[PDB]
């Protein structure tokens, strides 16, 4: 009989260790591929510096972490913990995004 944790118990330890640690959480090569995929449509054959893709990854992680903080605020406000896409759309709507 193996030992199993409960849903949420491991989640708090993961929240703590990811709030403590400062690294990037999405890999650099799919972000390079996605940035070069998107920037085709504005001008083809662009060279991306590694520092430019790293700066885009830093600002991307910062924007998504702030948006998920506001999503958790809105989901807590509606007496939920499981965030939902309407919370994302609401937190974008209040923020002045759309």
């Amino acid at each position: 009989k193996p030992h199993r944790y409960r849903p949420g118990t491991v989640a708090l330890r993961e929240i703590r260790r990811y709030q403590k640690s400062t690294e990037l959480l999405i890999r650099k090569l799919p972000f390079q591929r996605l940035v070069r995929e998107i920037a085709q449509d504005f001008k083809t054959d662009l060279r991306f510096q590694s520092s430019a893709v790293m700066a885009l990854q830093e600002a991307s992680e910062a924007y998504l972490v702030g948006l998920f903080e506001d999503t958790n605020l809105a989901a807590i406000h509606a007496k939920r913990v499981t965030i939902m896409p309407k919370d994302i759309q609401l937190a974008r709507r209040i923020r002045g995004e759309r």
Binding site: A11, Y18, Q19, I26, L34, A59, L64, G66, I83
Partner: protein, 84 residues
Amino acid sequence: HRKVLRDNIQGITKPAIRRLARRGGVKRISGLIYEETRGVLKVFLENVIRDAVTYTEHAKRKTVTAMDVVYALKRQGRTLYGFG
């Protein structure tokens, strides 16, 4: 060196979205969060990348520096510290 790219929004994966969510303090994440967050990321990258491309195309240049990404994030009001 000619190549076209496709379907790179699946490269930002679902247990790599869950880490960005659990950094922000989220305790439970629903199933339909992922495509919406990828779309949010897509429109944000499209705005900031279009700004960086106009910045580098004004300068008669062919590559994208990090300084132009910093200026593009400055014009959206999200200033980045650490690149000059």
